[PDB]
């Protein structure tokens, strides 16, 4: 009884953030100078989970090295985390089968795809789940979603869906994703003869935080065609492809919940984190013995940081420790990892900087992601959408156009490390 | 004009008893005159109007009924309103609610209310006008929980079909209204809708009550648009499609064209609204099977009977019997309704049944849950269970259940 | 009945401080008298049901409605227009007041129109009398409010300095109309929007200013101590300015002015002249107007969203009562300037301006 299990499907979203997912996987990269997996762990801790299993497929050692060293390996940790390795490019469905083929699920559990940020205390929703289940063992899953706006900055296309719920008992009777081209919403009327008040809602978020029952794994080994948790599973229950089961939505109306899946979300969530929408899970809390401190206009610093005179910091700015900022430089709406260092007479806006990054004097940065250990010379410039990887260096008097991703390896994108690295090229 | 103009004017409809066959066949009594609680079904829409503040409304009946109706209005109308009757010669039966006032458009001068002869309603009238006055929409439509029948669902193959209502709780605006006539194979929903008002509640146990309140300008649309046959059928969805369908940009010029809702510079319109309202008690409209209920539902009544002779060895209680009727020995009336000056024979049993006016029932019969039109007559020792009897029709010692008995032709 | 009610209205002077404040409101058209013009009905509904009903637009809609009343008035043949017209109009006011008490703005309009009826030239005719005072009304809407607003905004925005941090509170259409100007004239500044329970009027101000591209900051009134450290000026739109120099606006307006002065920020009062009153109030309780107490039961961050609370039965539990005053007075020692259409005046100079218009011989 005293067992709340929970699995987390890392790696399953490694492809969208590809240009950086080489030196570090996606479940290890920093969001506001803090890796994602912790943002997800402390979430599960809120739920009272006591046994966690983490699927891994990329940098498993690099993944497990953190976990085994993480604060979650100590005896004070609320749960016992064990990692699980499998083939690369892991499809959600295939995980649950391997889970079923292992016999690990004692009772009801939760599962997330990727890494989530949230403060929703699940201790009440599963109480709802455990309730309506103990009278109907055919209620196998309940879905946690966040009420929001149809054009909310935190609701992207993968999160953009349409639900139809029984306003009394909260049961998703119909679901469909939002693909531009799908102009209509088609529901078999045979449900109205079983439901009085139905609420068609396009305002949800679909945090993709589903709470599943021990049937689900065995329900996934059987019905092996199911790969996606929403495109295949839900559609099966609703089309009665599965032997008459029920699912439910627990639409949250306070607190916060979302997950990191897209570059157009990492930017969004970060602003939604700096803006304290997910208290206590905030830099100012310093859960990993950091030295952060909130300052007005939502600017965050760390101890033993050096800010020059005539260097000005605007709102929505975060500064890691051990980081230099030269004279007459202007930072704004920017997240900066620790051990960084900025040149002089520069201008940075809406950017993202990680650990051990340097910047030449008099450079212009904006709306770009700069990975760990990156060197930028003086006079350089770099515009929106730009994405770099680790080790990459850009020579002085250089520019990088929009969305021009790059790397330091021999793979698909157009990256090479030596200086300069665009019109003047290394590796080619 | 007692210093003050008129806010609205009320329109009442009295079409053929389309779905009330055994009761509405004859021309001796039309749909707008079947008794309900020993009062013609027309008494109720007007009484609601009379208490609403109206002092005069107009009524549009079929030509075959213009004679009997006002006769009741002259002698038989308990109210005090002044009813303008109207009988357009266009009413070719194929017409409906919209086509009617199209012919009599020139009578409207302000915003108007469209009730119906069956609009039985106890909903307080201020609740419908204010919400129109407050929200200043283009139309307001009243909906009610579908009527629940106390007795077992005997047979209900033609009960006001079934409706699907889409309403946004916040604005109380109406966004989906489709009955199971323009059906859907794989039933649809416009996604282009859900991108504004992304929350649409869907009700399925709701039924119409034919209480609509339109702004004045809608008539200008009704005159132009010939493709509008029934208000409930065609008008409302037309008004709901224009609410959200972008490309449905056919000239809304009827809005601005000096409609006079200011009335010079535009502080109004620029958009077409459409709301809905729901209650909880006493509000529906007869389409046959309701007549048994809305009459039964019409005994929050009181007590006594008048100008009626129930001899000894006879009992009757909590029933309603109108003037002049007579009941002869060893018979019994139970949970039943009996119209004007009917004749009840000896040793008969009429229970759970509705009896209109001017009917005579011979001795020793049984009437279990039946409806008998006016002028009728049933023969001795007959027995009817769940049967309807046509107007001025008679039956001799017959016996059947689940039968519509009518003078053959 | 009225005297019987007047007996009731006497007994409502008991131990409770708010014994005398009138709670009797009619929110429906049930049992309305007949002599009530339709356009008055639609108004009385808007008064009792609207919530972002600025004290200005009320006076306008009231007048524009009154034109339609007079335009449709019909004097009996045995009496000229002037005689027996207020009586008709007075029978309209008595309805409108039963929906929601007369604002100070609306009141002075009544007092003015009731006057021009008296001074009206008897030697005219109906269509002469009607067509006349409809301009008097339209002139009242021109000079006293609409133009006066356009003077205030320009006069107010002049004292806005580049780099300011402006603080408004609870949506004053006038105070919005000046910030939007200061945006369009090129002034570099930013706004703090203080809101409060129960009907969070501040959001609609936040909504407006945001849609005009204004840096805004939104905090509830409980954060005044926290947020005032950034503010450099305070802008308030009043419901009325008393004759002692006090400012009669919504609830928190007093604290806004107080907390500001104890942080050395100026309280700039933007209020028209027709909202000046010959009366004076030593406390924010003798003259005021209540809101329904139930509105602060739904404790959530919403008011229509029917999510209950613990106080839902307060009407039925003894020794428990919820209330929510809608206005309070702010002492003149806290108001720095009043921005009437006669320029920036000190609040104490109100009664003179009142006596200035009484030049109407």
- 3-state helix/strand/coil string of C184-247: HCCCCCCEEEEECCCCCCHHHHHHHHHHCCCCEEEEEHHHHHHHHHHCCEEEEECCEECCCCCE
β-pairing verdict for B394-395 and C166-169: unpaired
Other Cβ atoms within 10 Å of A381 Cβ, number: 16
Mutation target for B interface from A150, A151, A200, A239: give the one with most B CBs within 10 A: A200
Q: Choose among B166, B189, B199: nearest Cβ to A203.
A: B199
Taking an 8 Å cut-off on Cβ atoms, the answer to whether A201 and B202 are in contact is: no
- Residue B300 sits at the chain C interface (C-beta within 8 Å): no
Considering only alpha carbons, which residue of chain C is nearest residue B133? Answer: C42
Question: In chain A, what are the domain boundaries?
Answer: 1-292, 293-428
Taking an 8 Å cut-off on Cβ atoms, the answer to whether B194 and A185 are in contact is: yes
DSSP A231: I
A331: which 2 tokens? 């930072």
- Find the distance separating the first CA and the last CA of chain A, reported in whole Å: 60
Taking an 8 Å cut-off on Cβ atoms, the answer to whether C37 and B129 are in contact is: no
The span from the CA of C179 to the CA of C236, in Å, is 12
Considering only alpha carbons, which residue of chain C is nearest residue B53? Answer: C34
> Are residue B138 and residue B11 in the same domain, yes or no?
yes
Interface of C with B (CB under 8 A): 28-30, 32, 34-38, 41-42, 45-46, 49, 64, 72-74, 88, 304
End-of-domain residue from the set B253, B283, B301: B301
In the beta sheet, which residues pair with residue B173?
Answer: B168, B275
**Residues with Cβ < 8 Å from A303, sequence gap 6 or more?**
A291, A321
> Are residue B49 and residue B134 in the same domain, yes or no?
yes
Q: What is the dihedral of CA C307, C309, C315, C320, to 10 degrees?
A: -160
Whether B250 is in a domain gets the answer yes
Partners of A202 on chain B (C-beta within 8 Å) are 194-195, 198-199
B241: nearest Cα among B277, B214, B274, B196:
B274
Give the orientation angle of helix C104-118 with respect to helix C55-72, to 10 degrees. 30
Min distance A264 CA to chain B CA atoms (Å): 21
Report phi then psi at A349, rounded to 5. Answer: -145, 130
Taking an 8 Å cut-off on Cβ atoms, the answer to whether B4 and C72 are in contact is: yes
Give the orientation angle of helix C173-184 with respect to helix C202-211, to 10 degrees. 20
A256: nearest Cα among A385, A120, A72, A386:
A120
Scored b (16 or more CB within 10 A) or e, A75-85 reads: eeebbebebbe
Residue with tokens 């206005």: C327
B187: nearest Cα among A206, A142, A173, A245:
A173
Taking an 8 Å cut-off on Cβ atoms, the answer to whether B126 and C30 are in contact is: yes
The span from the CA of A267 to the CA of C346, in Å, is 50
Considering only alpha carbons, which residue of chain B is nearest residue C37? Answer: B4
Other Cβ atoms within 10 Å of A244 Cβ, number: 7
- Residue B201 sits at the chain C interface (C-beta within 8 Å): no
Q: Are C71 and C25 in contact (CB under 8 A)?
A: no
C227: nearest Cα among C192, C266, C269:
C192
> Are residue B271 and residue B388 in the same domain, yes or no?
no
> Are residue B124 and residue B226 in the same domain, yes or no?
yes
Min distance A197 CA to chain B CA atoms (Å): 5
**3-state secondary structure (DSSP) of residue C166:** strand
C241: which 2 tokens? 């300015």
| CB under 8 A, 24+ apart: contacts of B266-274 | B268/B136, B272/B138, B272/B239, B272/B242, B272/B243, B273/B135, B273/B136, B273/B137, B273/B138, B273/B139, B273/B173, B273/B243, B274/B137, B274/B138, B274/B139, B274/B141, B274/B173, B274/B174, B274/B175, B274/B236, B274/B239, B274/B240, B274/B243
Scored b (16 or more CB within 10 A) or e, A32-44 reads: bbbbbbbbbbbbb
Taking an 8 Å cut-off on Cβ atoms, the answer to whether B190 and A182 are in contact is: no
β-pairing verdict for B337-338 and B354-355: parallel
Taking an 8 Å cut-off on Cβ atoms, the answer to whether B7 and C29 are in contact is: no
Q: Choose among B2, B124, B133: nearest Cβ to C41.
A: B133
Angle at the Cα of B345 from the Cα atoms of B341 and B346, rounded to 5 degrees: 145
Find chains touching chain C: ≥3 CB pairs under 8 Å: B
DSSP A150: T
The CA–CA distances, whole Å, from B58 to B77, B86, B113, C140 equal: 15, 8, 10, 42
> Are residue B128 and residue B195 in the same domain, yes or no?
yes
- Show the beta-strand stretches assigned E in A148-245: 161-166, 172-177, 197-201, 209-212
DSSP B107: G
The span from the CA of A289 to the CA of A38, in Å, is 13
Residue range of the domain that includes B369: 302-409
Spell out where chain B is interrupted, by the residue before each break (C to N > 2.5 A).
261
C354: which 2 tokens? 């009142």
> Are residue B369 and residue B396 in the same domain, yes or no?
yes
Instruction: Give the containing element (helix H, strand E) for A24.
Output: none
Residue with tokens 């009826």: C117
Mutation target for B interface from A146, A157, A184: give the one with most B CBs within 10 A: A184
Considering only alpha carbons, which residue of chain C is nearest residue B129? Answer: C29
Taking an 8 Å cut-off on Cβ atoms, the answer to whether A198 and B195 are in contact is: no
B134: which 2 tokens? 């407050």
Residue with tokens 């849609």: C211
Whether B2 is in a domain gets the answer no
For this PDB entry, the determination method is: X-ray
Taking an 8 Å cut-off on Cβ atoms, the answer to whether C38 and B5 are in contact is: yes
In the beta sheet, which residues pair with residue A393?
Answer: A375
| CB under 8 A, 24+ apart: contacts of A391-396 | A391/A23, A391/A417, A392/A416, A392/A417, A392/A421, A393/A417, A393/A418, A393/A419, A393/A421, A394/A419, A394/A420, A394/A421, A394/A422, A395/A419, A395/A420, A395/A421, A395/A424, A396/A360, A396/A420
- Residue A194 sits at the chain B interface (C-beta within 8 Å): no
Partners of C66 on chain B (C-beta within 8 Å) are none
Angle at the Cα of C186 from the Cα atoms of C184 and C189, rounded to 5 degrees: 100
Taking an 8 Å cut-off on Cβ atoms, the answer to whether C30 and B124 are in contact is: yes
Whether B1 is in a domain gets the answer no
| CB under 8 A, 24+ apart: contacts of C26-31 | C26/C98, C26/C99, C27/C99, C28/B126, C28/B130, C29/B126, C29/B129, C29/B130, C29/B133, C30/B124, C30/B126
Min distance A184 CA to chain B CA atoms (Å): 5
**Residues with Cβ < 8 Å from A310, sequence gap 6 or more?**
A327, A328
> Are residue B292 and residue B353 in the same domain, yes or no?
no
Angle at the Cα of B131 from the Cα atoms of A148 and B243, rounded to 5 degrees: 55
Q: Choose among B184, B188, B202: nearest Cβ to A200.
A: B202
Q: Are C338 and C266 in contact (CB under 8 A)?
A: no
Taking an 8 Å cut-off on Cβ atoms, the answer to whether A189 and B187 are in contact is: yes
C62: nearest Cα among C85, C84, C44, C87:
C44
> Are residue B292 and residue B317 in the same domain, yes or no?
no
Half-sphere exposure of B405 (CA within 13 A, CB side): 27
- Show the beta-strand stretches assigned E in B34-99: 56-61, 82-86
Domain count of the fold of chain B: 2
Q: Are C34 and C301 in contact (CB under 8 A)?
A: no
Q: Are B154 and B386 in contact (CB under 8 A)?
A: yes
Taking an 8 Å cut-off on Cβ atoms, the answer to whether A196 and B201 are in contact is: no
Q: Choose among B129, B170, B262: nearest Cβ to C29.
A: B129
Report phi then psi at C324, rounded to 5. Answer: -150, 95
Q: Are A355 and A30 in contact (CB under 8 A)?
A: yes
Partners of C28 on chain B (C-beta within 8 Å) are 126, 130
Instruction: Give the containing element (helix H, strand E) for A90.
Output: none
Partners of A194 on chain B (C-beta within 8 Å) are none
Partners of C36 on chain B (C-beta within 8 Å) are 4
In the beta sheet, which residues pair with residue B344?
Answer: B327, B361
The span from the CA of A372 to the CA of A19, in Å, is 12
The span from the CA of B69 to the CA of C30, in Å, is 31
Q: Are C47 and C25 in contact (CB under 8 A)?
A: no
Ordered alpha helix ranges (H), B167-256: 191-194, 218-224, 236-244
Give resolution in angstroms: 3.3
> Are residue B16 and residue B110 in the same domain, yes or no?
yes
Scored b (16 or more CB within 10 A) or e, B87-101 reads: bbeebeeebbbbbbb
């Amino acid at each position: 009884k005293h067992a709340l299990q929970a699995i987390v499907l890392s790696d399953s979203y490694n492809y969208r953030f590809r240009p950086l997912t080489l030196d570090k996987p996606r479940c290890l990269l920093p969001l506001a100078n803090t890796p994602l997996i912790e943002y997800t762990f402390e979430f599960l801790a809120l739920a009272g989970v006591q046994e966690v299993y983490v699927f891994c497929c990329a940098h498993a050692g690099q993944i497990r090295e953190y976990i085994e060293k993480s604060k979650w390996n100590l005896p004070s940790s609320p749960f016992s985390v064990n990692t699980i390795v499998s083939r690369e490019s892991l499809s959600v469905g295939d995980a649950l089968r391997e889970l079923d083929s292992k016999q690990l699920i004692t009772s009801d559990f939760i599962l997330v795809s990727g890494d989530v940020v949230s403060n929703v205390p699940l201790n009440e929703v599963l109480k709802e789940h455990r309730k309506r289940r103990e009278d109907d063992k055919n209620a196998i899953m309940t879905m946690v979603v966040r009420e929001a706006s149809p054009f909310h900055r935190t609701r992207a296309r993968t999160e953009s869906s349409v639900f139809v719920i029984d306003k009394k008992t909260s049961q998703c009777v119909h679901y469909q994703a939002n693909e531009r081209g799908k102009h209509y919403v088609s529901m078999d009327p045979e449900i109205f003869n079983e439901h009085e008040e139905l609420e068609v809602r396009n305002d949800l978020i679909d945090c993709q935080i589903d709470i599943c029952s021990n049937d689900v794994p065995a329900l996934f080994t059987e019905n092996f065609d199911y790969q996606d948790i929403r495109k295949d599973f839900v559609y099966g229950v609703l089309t009665s492809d599965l032997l008459g089961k029920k699912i439910h939505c627990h639409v949250a109306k306070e607190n916060y919940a979302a997950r990191v899946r897209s570059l157009q979300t990492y930017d969004a969530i970060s602003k939604d984190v700096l803006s304290r929408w997910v208290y206590p899970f905030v830099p100012d809390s310093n859960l990993l013995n950091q030295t952060f401190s909130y300052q007005r206009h939502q600017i965050y610093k760390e101890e033993d940081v050096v800010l020059a005179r005539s260097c000005i910091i605007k709102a929505r700015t975060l500064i890691g420790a051990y980081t230099k900022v030269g004279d007459a430089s202007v930072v704004a709406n920017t997240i900066i990892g620790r051990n960084c260092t900025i040149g002089s007479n520069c201008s940075i806006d809406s950017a993202f900087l990680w650990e051990d990054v340097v910047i030449g004097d008099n450079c212009r940065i904006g709306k770009a992601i700069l990975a760990n250990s990156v060197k930028i010379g003086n006079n350089c410039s770099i515009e929106d959408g730009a994405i770099v990887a680790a080790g990459v260096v850009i020579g002085d008097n250089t520019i990088i156009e929009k969305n021009k991703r790059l790397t330091t390896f021999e793979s698909h994108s157009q990256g090479t490390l030596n200086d300069p690295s665009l019109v003047g090229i290394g590796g080619r | 004009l007692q210093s003050i103009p008129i806010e609205f004017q009320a329109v009442v409809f009295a079409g053929f008893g389309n779905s009330l066959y055994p009761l509405t066949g004859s021309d001796a009594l039309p749909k707008a005159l079947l008794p309900i609680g020993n009062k013609p079904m027309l008494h109720y829409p007007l009484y609601w109007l009379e208490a609403a503040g109206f002092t005069s409304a107009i009524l549009i009946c079929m030509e075959e009924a213009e004679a009997h109706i006002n006769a009741w209005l002259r002698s038989g109308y308990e109210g005090h309103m002044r009813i303008h009757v109207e009988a357009p010669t266009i009413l070719d039966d194929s017409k409906s609610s919209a086509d009617a006032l199209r012919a009599v458009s020139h009578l409207i001068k302000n915003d108007f209310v469209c009730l119906s002869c069956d609009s039985i309603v106890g909903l307080p009238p201020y609740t419908v006008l204010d919400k129109f006055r407050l929200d200043n929409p283009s139309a307001l439509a009243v909906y009610s929980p579908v009527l629940k029948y106390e007795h077992i669902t005997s047979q209900s193959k033609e009960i006001d079909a079934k409706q699907l209502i889409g309403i946004e709780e916040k604005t109380s605006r109406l966004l989906y209204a489709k009955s199971s006539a323009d059906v859907g194979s794989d039933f649809t929903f416009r996604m282009s809708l859900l991108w504004k008002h992304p929350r649409v509640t869907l009700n399925t146990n709701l039924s119409d009550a034919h209480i609509f309140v339109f702004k004045h300008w809608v008539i200008d649309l009704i005159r132009e648009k010939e493709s509008i046959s029934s208000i409930r059928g065609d008008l409302i969805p037309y008004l709901v499609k224009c609410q959200y369908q972008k490309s449905f940009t056919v000239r809304e010029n009827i809005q601005r064209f000096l409609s006079s809702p200011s009335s010079q510079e535009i502080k109004i319109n620029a958009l077409i609204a459409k709301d809905g309202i729901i209650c909880s008690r006493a509000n529906n409209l007869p389409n046959y099977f309701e007549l048994n209920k809305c009459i039964a539902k019409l005994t929050p009544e009181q007590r006594l009977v008048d100008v009626t002779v129930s001899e000894r060895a006879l009992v009757g209680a909590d029933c309603m019997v109108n003037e002049g009727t007579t009941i002869k020995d060893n018979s019994n009336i139970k949970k039943s309704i009996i119209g004007k000056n009917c004749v009840i024979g000896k040793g008969v049993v009429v229970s759970n049944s509705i009896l209109m006016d001017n009917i005579v029932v011979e001795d020793g019969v049984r009437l279990e849950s039946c409806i008998v039109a006016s002028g009728a007559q049933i023969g001795a020792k007959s027995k009817l269970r769940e049967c309807e009897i046509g107007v001025d029709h008679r039956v001799e010692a017959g016996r059947i259940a689940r039968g519509e008995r009518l003078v053959d032709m | 009945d009225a005297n019987l009610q007047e007996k009731k209205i006497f007994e409502e002077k008991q131990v409770s401080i708010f014994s005398h404040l009138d709670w009797r409101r009619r929110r429906t058209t049930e049992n309305i008298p007949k002599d009530i013009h339709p356009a008055v009905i639609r108004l009385g509904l808007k008064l009792a049901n609207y919530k972002i009903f600025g004290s200005n637009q009320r006076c306008i809609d009231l007048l524009k409605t009154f034109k339609i009343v007079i335009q449709d008035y019909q004097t009996p043949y045995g009496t000229t227009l002037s005689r027996h017209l207020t009586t008709h109009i007075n029978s309209q006011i008595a309805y409108l007041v039963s929906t929601r008490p007369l604002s100070i703005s609306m009141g002075n309009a009544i007092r003015f129109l009731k006057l021009e009826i008296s001074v009206l030239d008897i030697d005219l005719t109906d269509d002469e009398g009607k067509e006349l005072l409809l301009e008097k009304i339209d002139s009242y809407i021109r000079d006293r409010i609409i133009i006066a607003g356009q003077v205030i905004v320009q006069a107010a925005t002049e004292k806005i300095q580049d780099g300011d941090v402006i603080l408004t509170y609870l949506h004053s259409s006038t105070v919005n109309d000046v910030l939007i100007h200061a945006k369009n004239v090129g002034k570099k500044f930013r706004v703090v929007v203080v809101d409060s329970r129960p009907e969070f009027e501040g959001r609609v101000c936040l909504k407006l200013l945001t849609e005009h591209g204004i840096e805004c900051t939104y905090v509830m009134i409980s954060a005044l101590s926290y947020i005032m450290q950034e503010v450099t000026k305070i802008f308030l739109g009043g419901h009325a300015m008393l004759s002692n120099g006090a400012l009669y606006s919504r609830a928190g307006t007093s604290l806004i002015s107080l907390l500001g002065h104890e942080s050395n920020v100026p309280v700039i009062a933007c209020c028209e002249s027709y909202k000046f009153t010959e009366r004076i109030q030593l406390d924010s309780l003798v003259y005021n107007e209540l809101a329904p107490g139930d509105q602060l039961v739904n404790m959530g961050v919403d008011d229509f969203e029917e999510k209950p609370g613990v106080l839902a039965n307060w009407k039925s539990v003894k020794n428990l009562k919820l209330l929510s005053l809608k206005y309070d007075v702010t002492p003149p020692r806290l108001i720095t300037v009043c921005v009437c259409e006669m320029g920036l005046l000190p609040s104490t100079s109100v009664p003179a301006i009142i006596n200035e218009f009484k030049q109407v011989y």
